[PDB]
């Protein structure tokens with residue numbers, strides 16, 4: 001049943017930075033993916049209660065979603081771009097772990113992942 005607390009979006013004792021890459025990750029990469037027709041399952045933490053998936057957080061112990069990432073970027077939570085890319089990678093990987101190849105949700109993630117890889121290919125060099 002119940003949902004866990006969502007991942008933190010602020011941590012006062014974590015060092016933070018703004019870099020041009022992190023700017024780009026928010027203004028271009030996240031904001032492009034966000035507007036995609038297949039984005040909505042990934043825009044917030046999985047609501048396992050509403051979905052009647054009581055084993056979701058039994059299996060997925062490092063949950064991640066674009067809603068969390070968006071807020072992290074907005075709050076300058078990250079030290080560098082790679083920390084943020086890792087959160088995207090976790091989100092995709094979680095999807096592929098929990099679901100079956102060819103499930104609709106996997107097709108949705110895959111469309112987003114392909115687009116994600118296209119967009120980070122154009123990440124500007126650091127500073």
Ligand SMILES: Cc1cnc(Nc2ccc(N3CCN(C)CC3)cc2)nc1Nc1cccc(NS(=O)(=O)C(C)(C)C)c1
Pocket residue numbers: 040041042043044045046047048050051052053094095098099105
């Ligand atoms: C990111 C993600 C990864 N995996 C899955 N798997 C999944 C979802 C639904 C099902 N159904 C199976 C039988 N059926 C009757 C109910 C549900 C099976 C597997 N889902 C995801 N995201 C995702 C998929 C569908 C719906 C929502 N909505 S949500 O969590 O309430 C909100 C609006 C907060 C994002 C969110």
